[PDB]
Design a binder for this molecule. Structure first.
Ligand SMILES: O=P(O)(O)O[C@H]1[C@H](OP(=O)(O)O)[C@@H](OP(=O)(O)O)[C@H](OP(=O)(O)O)[C@@H](OP(=O)(O)O)[C@H]1OP(=O)(O)O
Lengths: 87, 317, 296, 651
């Protein structure tokens, strides 16, 4: 529950930051992709995916992350075959 | 026809003949791209050979006549030597090109008016503009008669000159050139019945030697006051519709009575009756018997999720 | 090989070509003297002649069946007139199922999914080298001089001894075929025929080469004019400077599309169609030396 | 292996018992896992000497095809469907062959199938639906028009033609066909109409019609939910919009999951739906946060360039953003869009797009010059007009345009507008380049054009120094002029004073060429092969003159040494050039190629060093003597190895 509340805060900072967090985006993206892969991580995938949305949305990191993280498209099509929750 | 005809039309006529000649020559392959020992020359026709072509078609009787006719074209600028211009046409194996082939293309105000008039005449000849008809004004019947008022309307409608003032001014320039002349007295172009005759006709050129959005599905035309009368054609009913994530799914498009335009068959409204052929007079309590449909559309959106609606529900009459 | 490098660069730059993964298979060439030198050995390759020989011995088919059928019907084949040859050639084609390469591509492939990918590469690679070979002038393309990659499926051309239409010039056994487009290769492609991948690929390759004609011309001019390499043109003849000028002009006409007629320029689709007819024409094929194997 | 071993032993009677059971398993109660097991058995049996198992005749070419289709093994399906085609060609087979290719993401193969149909069956056998599958919307419309004229109007042929119109984007004709036929139509076709009818109304911007149609679309359809959410954002129902989007995503579950299961390429269609959905989420912010707008535009711009260059997909995407952004508020989006329409061979739509951006109809106002306001737009129209075979007009407009540009520059140049001034120079540069290439296509090559087209390219070079194309085009122009003048001497003099005049004339054009090629080599930085070879041709021919040599000396210093590795063969060919000033600079150039990257030089040098002619081997040894000092080990190693390899090569 500690990591879950930290993720919900980072997600709310994303929208408020207004492009001032770009310098740190590559740092948080590595961290989150480390946490996205595998179900071992205690943090819920739901909130993990939600905060990643808020980062991509506010900071405007599009297309370029695909080059840095090539497994992103393979990771996100794996949830569609695994996850049962709608949200 | 005076100086206006003698000057402008003669200039026009040679250009029309030169254009007719160029098209014929291209069909005959006289003008073709050439390369002189690895030095290309596109769209070229050899001067000396051309004289032979003219003699076969009978345009020029002999070398003198061919040179004179080509010299007249050169004095106008319709043709030019591919390399440094030789001015007067010469009977030599030399490459020449037409001005209209974009080699020089010297444009002028007269040419632009002439070219536009020629293009308009093609439109006038076509069925698209059928204003040309035999009509009588001032007691005389003339062919190719089109009302000046009708022509100005056609220009705006066609889009050749969207602004009426610009269209009318353009005709005055053509009238000065003589392209269009009022049938009887050459009265200047005005937005009136004034019948005009096209003095310049492109066809038969000269010879060289001679130079529902809205949709309505309601059968009942009007129900204003027909409904207000108690009893008779319909029986009132009140429908309460609950909001949905996908929306209610109904449209009202009646001006005065605000009749229901369409209803989503799979929506909640269709489940709770709400047939297409209905009329409404009150929404969520407020009576909307006499308002616009859009105004009612504002009220239903600004209201709560659940809507109270009264349906006239005509009984198959 | 320097030329192929240039063309590969152009194909990489074009997005349409890049999307289709068009490229020429090339290998290292290192001269050591006027006589000797090193050639880079391409792995996973074998000559087309070997494949057909080994397939026909497996299936107990006679290796020289097409030749034997011709000599049986008319033993004077070499001395027959043009029309007579066309008849003899056609009689052989009608009585032989020319599907050996297509059939063996299936059997060799482990699975259908791989087989399809091998065939797509095969068809495109052939079209690419057909157009490039035409411009370069590469003749004498008998099945011993081209080999097929048994994994990627791409075609490879080797031993470019004959260039600039040398085969057409020579009096003995003149070759009238611009590039090898024989029936067996056509059968190996999609069932519909040349109308599909081969034709579309040819259009793309021709368009790119025409757009960059100046780049192609620059490479061609430098090596042709070299005095050391002038000997090949002189041998083809029967001075040397005059002969070189004509060759460059002929190559320029192909890029422009004026090769067939200097007077009239031809668009890329029209020019490609005329080339296909010349390659597939029965009359042209019959003249070709029998060692070229016009019946495979 | 078990199967083959068993199936060989059985004396045909047991084989039929087995084959009959195989048929029942495939025909009835088919399970994907069992099927793909038995399909892999049939393929394995094909490779075997025994031959394919004969089931119900024809080796089950029909059954196995149907079974592979449900397994989504589209490569097996294709192979089997080709065997049936070999036995006989039928229209039904051709249809299935086409659909297989489209599922396999091989458009070119399917197009070839249509060419076969044209030849062998003519035209009647080709249904209009076949063009629809091939995305031949132009030919499909011709087919649906021919069919709907003769045959009486039918729901199927009406929807087919309307479906083609929406793909082309002819919203005018599509909305007329809708309004004409509503009461004439059944409720089943009605629901299949509104999805296309709404697109037409939305395209024209008539929101009342759009509301009527959307209610008729079924809610269950994923597309219908999206259309409803659009009428939410038009009415500012932000709260309801978010609700409708979520249901829309839920319905995309089934489509995204199925397509993703079998390759990413099939999933692209679904991927575009979510793209447009998440863009609609960023329209709510755009309507609420004025402070976020310029960020959104940059995001929108960067996102659209990652998406694939298909015109249909772009039209969809642009229609969404156009809900809150008029085309004038973002020009570059619609210009890049028009360019795709131009490249795809649909200039009519490109023309309409450009007319909408220009504001007026240039074709109607032939006398009037093209408007100057928004010049980047005007330029796109001219280069479109050129593709439309109206070159005579385009060329004249370009001459007028540059006069306006250069006058608009001079009069408006203040200290403030420096970015504006810089942009204007960049534009004019691209204009000047078009002038040249156009002048050559229009006029030709002769004595008068070359001085003119040089004047243009020179101006272009001035206005954009860094731009590669401006230098390359100027350089190539000068080089051609040098060759042309030389041929003129050959034609007239060969076939005293003229050569000395030609010396001044050619040197007038040679010095520009050298400076240009050296600058166009550095700019390309990896695609300089053409330019570098042209330098060599010029150097060898005329470099013996002092002035051409001088320019080369400064150039050889300036140019990077990596460039020369491309043309190492051509250099050594002229190692013994009789002209001293050339050969002396060759040595000095090779010297510096030796000092860095000697591995690129040793092999061709060793061949020259043992050449029979004295001058080649003397020069090569003199260079090797200098190469030895840096390493010497390489020279000894390569000289031995090469000598031994030659001995090996011929005993
Ligand atoms: O198609 P072209 O006539 O050759 O025009 C191209 C094309 O411009 P369009 O956007 O108008 O099609 C390039 O764009 P791409 O489609 O290749 O992305 C553009 O390049 P940029 O995208 O880098 O701007 C390039 O411009 P430039 O010459 O400045 O490199 C421009 O060339 P022209 O304007 O000279 O025709």
């Amino acid at each position: 529950g500690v990591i879950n509340n930290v993720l919900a805060t980072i997600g709310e900072l994303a929208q408020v930051s207004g492009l001032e967090m770009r310098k740190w985006v590559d740092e948080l993206f590595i961290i989150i992709m480390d946490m996205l892969q595998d179900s071992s991580l205690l943090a819920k995938r739901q909130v993990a995916l939600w905060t990643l949305g808020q980062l991509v949305a506010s900071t405007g990191y599009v297309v370029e992350p695909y080059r840095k993280y090539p497994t992103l498209l393979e990771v996100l099509l794996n949830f569609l075959k695994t996850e049962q929750n709608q949200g | 026809g005076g100086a206006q005809q003698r000057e402008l039309e003669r200039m026009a006529e040679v250009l029309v003949t030169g254009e007719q000649l160029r098209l014929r020559l291209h069909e005959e392959k006289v003008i073709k791209d050439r390369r002189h020992h690895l030095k290309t020359y596109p769209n070229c026709f050899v001067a000396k050979e051309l004289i032979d072509w003219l003699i076969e078609h009978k345009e020029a009787s002999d070398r003198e006549t061919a040179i004179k006719l080509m010299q007249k074209l050169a004095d106008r600028g319709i043709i030019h030597h591919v390399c440094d211009e030789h001015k007067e046409f010469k009977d030599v194996k030399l490459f020449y090109r037409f001005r209209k082939d974009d080699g020089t293309f010297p444009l002028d105000n007269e040419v632009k008016a002439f070219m536009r008039g020629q293009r308009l005449y093609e439109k006038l000849m076509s069925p698209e503009n059928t204003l040309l008809q035999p009509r009588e004004e001032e007691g005389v019947k003339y062919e190719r008669t089109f009302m000046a008022s009708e022509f100005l309307d056609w220009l705006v409608q066609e889009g050749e000159a969207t602004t009426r003032k610009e269209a009318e001014q353009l005709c005055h320039r053509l009238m000065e050139h003589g392209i269009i002349q009022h049938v009887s007295s050459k009265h200047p172009f005005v937005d009136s019945n004034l019948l005009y005759q096209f003095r310049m006709n492109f066809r038969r050129r000269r010879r060289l030697m001679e130079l529902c959005n809205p949709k309505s599905v309601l059968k009942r035309p009007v129900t204003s006051e027909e409904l207000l009368t108690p009893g008779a054609p319909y029986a009132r009913k009140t429908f309460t519709i609950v909001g949905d994530a996908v929306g209610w799914g109904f449209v009202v498009r009646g001006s005065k009575p605000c009749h229901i335009q369409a209803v989503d068959p799979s929506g909640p409204a269709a489940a709770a009756g709400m047939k297409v052929c209905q009329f409404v007079v009150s929404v969520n309590g407020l009576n909307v018997l006499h308002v616009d449909y859009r105004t009612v559309n504002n009220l239903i959106l600004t209201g709560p999720r659940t809507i109270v609606m009264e349906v006239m529900e005509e009984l198959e009459c | 090989m320097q030329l192929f490098g240039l063309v590969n660069t152009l194909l990489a730059n074009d997005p349409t070509s890049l999307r289709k993964n068009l490229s020429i298979q090339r290998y290292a060439v290192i001269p050591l003297s006027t006589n000797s030198g090193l050639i880079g050995w391409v792995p996973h390759c074998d000559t087309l002649h070997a494949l057909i020989r080994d397939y026909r011995e497996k299936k107990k088919i006679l290796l020289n069946i097409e030749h034997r059928i011709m000599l049986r019907m008319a033993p004077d084949y070499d001395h027959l007139t043009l029309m007579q040859k066309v008849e003899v050639f056609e009689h052989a084609v009608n009585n032989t199922a020319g599907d050996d390469l297509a059939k063996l591509l299936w059997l060799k492939s482990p699975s259908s999914e791989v087989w399809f990918d091998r065939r797509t590469n095969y068809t495109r690679s052939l079209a690419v080298m057909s157009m490039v070979g035409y411009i370069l002038g590469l003749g004498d393309r008998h099945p011993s001089n081209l080999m097929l990659d048994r994994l990627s499926g791409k075609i490879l051309h080797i031993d470019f001894g004959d260039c600039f239409e040398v085969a057409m010039t020579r009096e003995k056994f003149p070759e009238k075929i611009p590039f090898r487009l024989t029936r067996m290769l056509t059968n190996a492609m999609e069932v519909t025929g040349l109308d599909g991948n081969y034709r579309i690929t040819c259009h793309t390759v021709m368009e790119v080469l025409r757009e960059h004609k100046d780049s192609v011309m620059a490479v061609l001019e430098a090596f042709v004019y070299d005095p050391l390499l002038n000997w090949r043109l002189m041998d083809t003849n029967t001075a040397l400077n005059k002969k070189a000028i004509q060759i460059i002009n002929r190559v320029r006409d192909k890029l422009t599309g004026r090769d067939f007629s200097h007077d009239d320029t031809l668009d890329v689709p029209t020019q490609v169609e005329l080339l296909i007819k010349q390659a597939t024409s029965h009359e042209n094929l019959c003249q070709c030396y029998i060692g070229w194997c016009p019946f495979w | 292996a078990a199967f083959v071993s068993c199936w060989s032993e059985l004396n045909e009677d047991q084989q039929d018992e087995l084959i009959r059971s195989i048929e029942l398993a495939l025909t009835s109660q088919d399970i994907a896992e069992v099927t793909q097991t038995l399909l892999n058995l049939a393929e394995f049996m094909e490779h075997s000497d025994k031959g394919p198992l004969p089931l119900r005749d024809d080796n089950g070419i029909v059954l196995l095809g149907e079974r592979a289709a449900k397994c989504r093994a589209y490569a097996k399906a294709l192979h089997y469907k080709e065997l049936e085609f070999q036995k006989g060609p039928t229209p039904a087979i051709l249809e299935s062959l086409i659909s297989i290719n489209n599922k396999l993401q091989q458009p070119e193969a399917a197009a070839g199938v249509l060419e076969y149909a044209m030849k062998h069956f003519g035209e009647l056998e080709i249904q209009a639906t076949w063009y629809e599958k091939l995305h031949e919307w132009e030919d499909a419309l011709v087919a649906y028009d021919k069919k709907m004229d003769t045959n009486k109007d039918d729901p199927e042929l009406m929807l087919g033609r309307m479906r083609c119109l929406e793909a082309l984007g002819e919203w005018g004709q599509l909305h007329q066909q809708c309004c004409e036929k509503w009461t004439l139509v059944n409720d089943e076709t009605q629901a299949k109409m509104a999805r296309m009818a709404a697109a037409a109304a939305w395209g024209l911007g008539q929101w009342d019609s759009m509301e009527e149609y959307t209610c008729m679309i079924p809610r269950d359809t994923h597309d219908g939910a999206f259309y409803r959410a659009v009428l939410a954002l038009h009415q500012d129902l932000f709260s309801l919009a978010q609700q409708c989007i979520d249901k829309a995503r839920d319905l995309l579950d089934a489509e995204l999951t199925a397509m993703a299961g079998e390759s990413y390429s099939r999933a692209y269609g679904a991927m575009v739906s979510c793209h447009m959905l998440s863009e609609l989420e960023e329209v709510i912010q755009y309507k609420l946060v004025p402070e976020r707008r310029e960020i959104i535009r940059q995001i929108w711009w960067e996102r659209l360039q990652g998406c694939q260059r298909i015109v249909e997909d772009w039209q969809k995407i642009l229609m969404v953003r156009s809900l809150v952004v008029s085309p004038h508020e973002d020009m570059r989006t619609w210009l890049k869009y028009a360019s795709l329409c131009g490249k795809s061979g649909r200039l009519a739509l490109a023309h309409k797009t450009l007319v909408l951006l220009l504001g007026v109809d240039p074709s109607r106002q032939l006398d009037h010059p093209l408007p100057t306001v928004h010049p980047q737009v005007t330029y796109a129209y001219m280069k479109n007009m050129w593709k439309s075979a109206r070159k005579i007009d385009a060329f004249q407009h370009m001459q007028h345009f540059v006069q306006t540009m250069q006058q608009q520059a001079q009069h408006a140049i203040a200290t403030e507008d420096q970015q504006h001034k810089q942009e204007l120079h960049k534009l004019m540069a691209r204009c000047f380049l078009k002038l040249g290439e156009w002048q050559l296509n229009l006029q030709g090559i002769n004595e008068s054009t070359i001085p003119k087209v040089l004047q243009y390219y020179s101006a272009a070079t001035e206005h954009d120094r860094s731009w590669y194309k401006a230098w390359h085009a100027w350089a190539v122009m000068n080089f051609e002029a040098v060759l042309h003048y030389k041929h003129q001497n050959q034609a007239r003099d060969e076939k005293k004073k003229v050569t000395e005049d030609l010396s001044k004339t050619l040197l007038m054009y040679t010095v520009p060429a050298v400076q240009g090629f050296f600058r166009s080599i550095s700019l390309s930085r990896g695609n300089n092969l053409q330019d570098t070879l042209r330098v060599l041709t010029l150097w060898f021919d005329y470099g013996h003159w002092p002035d051409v040599n001088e320019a080369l000396v400064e150039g050889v210093k300036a140019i990077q040494i990596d460039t020369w590795l491309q043309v190492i063969p051509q250099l050594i060919a002229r190692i013994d050039t009789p002209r001293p000033l050339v050969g002396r600079l060759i040595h000095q150039l090779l010297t510096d190629i030796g000092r860095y990257h000697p591995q690129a030089l040793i092999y061709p040098l060793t061949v020259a060093s043992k050449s029979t002619t004295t001058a080649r081997h003397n020069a090569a040894n003199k260079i090797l003597k200098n190469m030895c000092e840096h390493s010497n080990t390489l020279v000894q190693q390569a000289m031995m190895v090469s000598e031994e390899l030659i001995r090996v090569a011929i005993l």
